[PDB]
Amino acid sequence: AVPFVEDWDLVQTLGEGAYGEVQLAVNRVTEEAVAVKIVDMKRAVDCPENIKKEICINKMLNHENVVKFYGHRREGNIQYLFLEYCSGGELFDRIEPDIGMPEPDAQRFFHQLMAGVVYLHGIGITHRDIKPENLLLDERDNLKISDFGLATVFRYNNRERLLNKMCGTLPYVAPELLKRREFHAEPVDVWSCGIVLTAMLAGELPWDQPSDSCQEYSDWKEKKTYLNPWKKIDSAPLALLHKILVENPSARITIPDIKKDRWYNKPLK
Numbered sequence: 001a002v003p004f005v006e007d008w009d010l011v012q013t014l015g016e017g018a019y020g021e022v023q024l025a026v027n028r029v030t031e032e033a034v035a036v037k038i039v040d041m042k043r044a045v046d047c048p049e050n051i052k053k054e055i056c057i058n059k060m061l062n063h064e065n066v067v068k069f070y071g072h073r074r075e076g077n078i079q080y081l082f083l084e085y086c087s088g089g090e091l092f093d094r095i096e097p098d099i100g101m102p103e104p105d106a107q108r109f110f111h112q113l114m115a116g117v118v119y120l121h122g123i124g125i126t127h128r129d130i131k132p133e134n135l136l137l138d139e140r141d142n143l144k145i146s147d148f149g150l151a152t153v154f155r156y157n158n159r160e161r162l163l164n165k166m167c168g169t170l171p172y173v174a175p176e177l178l179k180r181r182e183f184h185a186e187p188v189d190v191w192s193c194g195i196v197l198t199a200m201l202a203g204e205l206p207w208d209q210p211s212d213s214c215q216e217y218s219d220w221k222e223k224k225t226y227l228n229p230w231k232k233i234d235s236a237p238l239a240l241l242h243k244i245l246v247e248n249p250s251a252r253i254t255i256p257d258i259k260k261d262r263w264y265n266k267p268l269k
């Protein structure tokens with residue numbers, strides 16, 4: 001940090017990651033911008049192992065819809081991760097509250113989200129916290145999946161394992177996390193992508209959590225798409241959401257079948 005901070009301006013805070021605060025750093029000579037995630041390992045006894053794992057997963061990644069990882073180093077009890085600066089900001093800030101964004105924009109972002117998730121799943125990694133705060137944008141509005149603090153390996157070579165950790169952000173979590181002791185990784189990420197699509201199209205999360213005790217979730221199970229947020233969503237993308245937000249993960253649409261969906265393939269304005 002010492003010589004680094006002589007040559008690089010830590011201009012401002014960008015946000016909070018799973019494991020630490022992220023700063024914009026700009027080199028005074030070249031004006032290169034990088035995002036620096038600063039992780040205080042004293043915040044938990046397991047933080048050193050947890051951040052080591054985030055680093056390890058980052059080293060596996062190379063895809064146009066995933067935030068680039070440049071490197072890392074430790075200074076005392078602080079770990080520094082050096083990440084792509086995504087100058088388009090968070091997808092969250094393209095969503096007008098209670099309105100969403102135009103359907104063509106939501107469709108394009110959703111295609112890019114699928115590309116990134118397909119990539120991750122192909123290498124056996126699940127993100128586990130997909131939400132608009134963790135979907136950044138570059139200078140050409142290309143989506144970049146961000147923050148692998150909660151990510152884990154669900155397939156070792158061609159051998160899947162079940163997961164059991166209740167992690168993620170509650171309004172985005174799939175119902176099987178509240179019902180099953182162990183579950184498949186991929187349908188959990190598919191579900192959160194559906195909640196992201198809902199938010200992009202209507203500017204509103206549909207429920208606190210996907211429990212039968214949550215009235216808004218019961219309303220969706222009972223096909224009450226005449227209520228918000230659903231009544232704001234056109235029938236074509238709503239038909240896709242009906243296939244994604246399926247309670248039984250075994251019956252839930254898979255990404256290869258999302259690719260065949262009418263709305264997914266629909267030419268928009």
Ligand SMILES: Cc1cc2n[nH]c(=O)n2c2cc(-c3ccc[nH]3)ccc12
Pocket residue numbers: 014015016017022035067083084085086087088089090136146
């Ligand atoms: C939390 C976070 C992590 C991150 N890693 N790389 C990045 O650019 N960011 C971020 C960038 C922004 C941003 C706001 C405006 C332009 N950009 C915000 C948060 C992050």
